Each structure stands twice: as structure tokens, then as C-alpha cells.
Ligand binder design. Structure first.
Ligand SMILES: Nc1nc2c3ccc(S(N)(=O)=O)cc3nc(Cc3ccc4c(c3)OCO4)n2n1
Length: 207
């Protein structure tokens, strides 16, 4: 288990998302589904040129898994997955320009729902989650667990839990007052409103 500091701009973004009063929290779901869809687009493209890239699973889709016992909502995809370098370095580095632009837009009248237009929608997870755990497996790399409760740091470890094949699971440990997002009716509503045209099956698990 290694502990890393977020780059200052990302820690700043995370604090803004946690601290700002903003009632329209439900858009976190569209942001994460969109991330999943992008990752599924990547493996679909790559597998078209190299069919063996689907040896780790042919099916391209999204699962939404609420668990009231654990108070978690898990977004699972069989997209391309992330490498250790992505989790530790690449994605945070790239996110710096998007963060800065988002923060400037918010000063000029944008609102937190527009976060995806700056390519940093993953962090919208913190609108609703006290802790986010990401399990991810990319072809030719090992399975990793990334985790953060914000506060300026995150961890990465090699994951020795159940193997997942290929893709990403974002496990949202929901804030105590955000359990509405475990409700079937509420999730279906939000998917219908903001994620209506995703080009992959989205299966909402029931409890
Ligand atoms: N679900 C999902 N999948 C990805 C993803 C997949 C591949 C690639 S890659 N190798 O082409 O650069 C990037 C991906 N990025 C995201 C979004 C994201 C951003 C930051 C994260 C994160 C996910 O998990 C922890 O920190 N996500 N989110």
C-alpha cells in the first residue's frame, strides 16, 4: 500500500467539490457513466484492430450495483481499464489544465454540473461519496486498487481481491445523507434524465 499526495490543483478541486454548497449532486452518476462509456469506446476501437484484446472478456457494458448493507453504489464497466501509471501519474497530470479551466469558469458563472466539459468529471464522485475506491484492470497490467477519502492523498495497491478480467469498478462509499442513490427508483430516474443515450447496456442491479 503506497500513499501519494494529489497534485495541489486536484486537491484544491476536490475541496471545492466537497465544500461548495450545491444541491444538484445527482449529476455524479452521468459523469461516471460517461467515463465508463469512453473507456468502453477505447477497448471497442482497440479490439477492432486486435481481436485478442477481448480475450479478457467480450461483453462491453455497464453495471450499476447498489448495496444498502455496505452503503455503496458501484459503477462497473468492462472498458479498457487503467494502468498503474494512469492511476498514480498520467490522469492527475492531464487533469491539471482541466481543473484550472473549470475553476476559472466557475468564477465566471459556470456551475459544478458542467465539470464534465472540462474532462475532470471523475471527481464529481465526491459530491456524494465520503470515500471512493477504484478497482481497475488493463490488458497486460495487473489489477490495482486506488482509494481516497480526499484530504490531499490517495493510495494505490496491487489488488489481491476477486480478479475482474478487464475494466473498472468505481465503488462509492456514500455520505450518510446521500443514501437516496441506493434507491432503485432514484437511480432509474437519474439514468433516464442524464444518461439516456449511452451506447452500451446499463444494468441496474436490484437488492
Ligand atoms: N471507468 C473509468 N475508466 C476510465 C479510464 C479508462 C482508461 C483511461 S486511459 N488508459 O485511456 O488513459 C482513463 C480512464 N479514466 C477514467 C476516469 C478516471 C480519472 C481519474 C481517476 C479514475 C478514473 O479513477 C481514479 O482516478 N476512467 N474511468
Amino acid at each position: 500500500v503506497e500513499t501519494f499526495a494529489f497534485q495541489a490543483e486536484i486537491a484544491q478541486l476536490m475541496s471545492l467539490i466537497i465544500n461548495t454548497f450545491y444541491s444538484n449532486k445527482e449529476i455524479f452518476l452521468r459523469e461516471l457513466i460517461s467515463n465508463s462509456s469512453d473507456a468502453l469506446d477505447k477497448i471497442r476501437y482497440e479490439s477492432l484492430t486486435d481481436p485478442s484484446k477481448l480475450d479478457s472478456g467480450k461483453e462491453l457494458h455497464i453495471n450499476l450495483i447498489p448495496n444498502k448493507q455496505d452503503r455503496t453504489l458501484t459503477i462497473v464497466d468492462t472498458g479498457i481499464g487503467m494502468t498503474k501509471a494512469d492511476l498514480i501519474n498520467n490522469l492527475g497530470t492531464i487533469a491539471k489544465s482541466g481543473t484550472k479551466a473549470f475553476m476559472e469558469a466557475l468564477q465566471a458563472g459556470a456551475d459544478i454540473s458542467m465539470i464534465g466539459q472540462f474532462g475532470v468529471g471523475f471527481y464529481s464522485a465526491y459530491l456524494v461519496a465520503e470515500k471512493v475506491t477504484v478497482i481497475t484492470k488493463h490488458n497486460d497490467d495487473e489489477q490495482y486498487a486506488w482509494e481516497s477519502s480526499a484530504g490531499g492523498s490517495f493510495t494505490v495497491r496491487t489488488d489481491t481481491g476477486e480478479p475482474m478480467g478487464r475494466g473498472t469498478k468505481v465503488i462509492l462509499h456514500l455520505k450518510e445523507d446521500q443514501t437516496e442513490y441506493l434507491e432503485e427508483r432514484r437511480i432509474k430516474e437519474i439514468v433516464k434524465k442524464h444518461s439516456q443515450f449511452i451506447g452500451y447496456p446499463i444494468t441496474l442491479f436490484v437488492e
